[PDB]
Amino acid sequence: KSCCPNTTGRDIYNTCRLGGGSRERCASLSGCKIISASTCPSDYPK
Amino acid sequence: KSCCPNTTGRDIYNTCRLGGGSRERCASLSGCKIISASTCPSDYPK
């Protein structure tokens, strides 16, 4: 599960994904984290 | 040089660069232009 610090991070991640990027690369490019739970924590809520 | 349309575009571009993205990749995510000269156009001043 990707979890992002804010909406802009989410938008970067999503855009990177839409273009074909891998999850871990897109997380790095966006500031998002890949976690093992399906619900995001309140500090990476987006 | 990266030339960005607005400060959000700058923030996105720089986040992507901080995550190891190439200039071209980060330009695509941000809407910024990569210009190989020092003066940005007025419409991409950030």
UniProtKB/Swiss-Prot annotation, chains A, B:
Q: List the disulfide bonds.
A: 3-40, 4-32, 16-26
Name the domain of life. Answer: Eukaryota
Q: Where in the cell is it found?
A: Secreted
The text of the family note is: Belongs to the plant thionin (TC 1.C.44) family.
The record describes the protein's role as: Thionins are small plant proteins which are toxic to animal cells. They seem to exert their toxic effect at the level of the cell membrane. Their precise function is not known.
Give the protein name, as stated in the record: Viscotoxin-B
Q: Report where the shown chain sits in the full-length sequence: first residue, last residue, total length.
A: 7 to 52 of 103
